[PDB]
Symmetry: none
Subunit: 303 residues, 2 copies
């Protein structure tokens, strides 16, 4: 099985049928005390653990989420996991906390207010990667900082091969902990720019990073991807999209495709293309987890 | 007893370490993209019926909440009403629905933006206010619109005097329904900007509104309140808060006090003062229902602010 260590999040998408600006009051200190009804408040399913697990599930793989939700608002995702046949074993629900979530409100003129609450994601380290069962492969993506660090350590202790994917959590890393995570890692995935940040932060050249992992995966997105291994470098081409609707989640779809390749028999040339294709399949849809290709639709679109 | 019609909600209170006034200006033209971190979210018992009931209950009144909750998450609020000695006869719980959820963001100016996910509140008209027994007085506060209008008509038909408190529900009213609600109403409570809205929407002046009820009560935040009744106008002084912690529920705490004053035969000056005190007692604590003054404390604080002890006439 594949142990997907990452954050589990909701995006609450809210619409204000009105205009924010018409609600500043002319008080000595500008007053705003706006309340508005959101009867069609949307629940978008997110977080990288969720996104990748969803992508690995569609491929026919066996995905195991290790992430933390909040008891205040866990049920919807728990319900969704069960209906998708996803294991909830390593999904810990913590009391008196909210799940990781963004609140996104747009008015009629398309002005936006975004509040992110980290929530249950900041206590993801209560889930210990090593103390599991039947894991052949993992991934560590963006999560609460402590969780990310602990997972890398415990996955190595247990001897599990794992993709280190610091993602948007990369700015929290210093020279030393980034250097440490790379050595313990078996693979690493980043985009072209993050690869550059990693070089700049570690003080190691790309060559030096490569020698410390079985593969270094650099996604260029719309210009494709690259996979640097022992024998050399695969040049993964970009997959032609049906349409561009929402780029949000493509990276995680790409990873879902990638993790299927490693766990199964596929070489880096096929696995890299599998990844690429997953990124193109999600983009033609709104949200991270709305695209739902059947497996036969994936291998037909592969050839 | 006093029937408290209004929303029952869980408040989800977030802090913005900044000022909305710095990012939302009406003279500006660019697309707003305010993005911020909310390190803390506080879950609290809220909703206008809950808050007003809690306040009336603190004073020793008999508050009967009439509102709807959702089955998926009603339980802790029900357990709380039991613990508070608040009767649930008129609280109805609806299957396969969430209770109302307020997503409240507060900034360093104590300015607020609320996204209100009504859920079970949208079904609040499953309650019939005209069937409530032993009711001598009522408030109709912010709720699902259909429920608001229905409570209004039913309480009037049954001859129960009521305060019409449209509050955040006001944009849901058109002119004719607003006018009709006021005609049916015995008292109106609004804040100062809501009063202007009522005037603009009804086409009535504040003078004309006042003439159509026993009292028009207008709250002025930190400047206290105005009560326009048949025999003059009372200007209610603010109570300086012991400290300013959380404005959520201040208006409701005020309504709690006002309702107590009306039932125990307080004159408008004394009723408004008590209302104004409850507001200040509330603000010194986090959450709309965290404050728990004794009746003795309420009384001592009233005298300290106003110069006499509040008495029924």
């Amino acid at each position: 099985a594949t142990l997907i260590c990452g954050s589990i999040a909701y995006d609450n998408i809210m619409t204000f049928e009105g205009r924010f600006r018409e609600h500043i009051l002319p008080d000595q200190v500008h007053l705003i005390n706006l309340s508005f009804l959101v009867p069609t408040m949307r629940r978008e399913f997110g977080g990288c653990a969720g996104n990748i697990a969803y992508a690995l599930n569609l491929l026919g793989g066996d995905a195991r989420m290790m992430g933390t939700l909040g008891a205040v608002d866990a049920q919807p995702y728990l319900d969704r996991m069960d209906a998708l046949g996803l294991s909830r074993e390593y999904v810990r629900v913590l009391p008196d906390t909210y799940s990781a979530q963004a609140m996104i409100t747009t008015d009629l003129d398309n002005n936006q207010i975004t509040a992110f609450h980290p929530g249950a994601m900041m206590q993801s380290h209560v889930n210990h990667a090593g103390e599991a069962k039947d894991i052949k492969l993992a991934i560590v993506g963006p999560d609460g900082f402590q969780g990310m660090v602990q997972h890398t350590e415990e996955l190595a202790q247990a001897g599990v091969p794992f993709i280190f994917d610091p993602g948007q959590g990369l700015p929290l890393f210093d020279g030393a902990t980034l250097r440490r995570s790379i050595e313990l890692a078996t693979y690493i995935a980043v985009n072209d720019y993050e690869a550059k940040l990693v070089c700049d932060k570690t003080g190691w050249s790309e060559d030096e990073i490569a020698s410390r992992v079985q593969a270094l995966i650099i996604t260029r997105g719309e210009h494709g991807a690259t996979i640097r291994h022992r024998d050399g470098t695969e040049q993964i081409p970009a997959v032609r999209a049906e349409r561009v609707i929402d780029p949000t989640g493509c990276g995680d779809a790409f990873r879902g495709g990638l993790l299927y390749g490693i766990e199964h028999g596929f070489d880096w040339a096929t696995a890299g293309r599998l990844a690429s294709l997953m990124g193109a399949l999600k983009i033609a849809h709104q949200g991270p987890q709305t695209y739902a290709p059947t497996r036969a639709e994936i291998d037909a679109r592969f050839e």
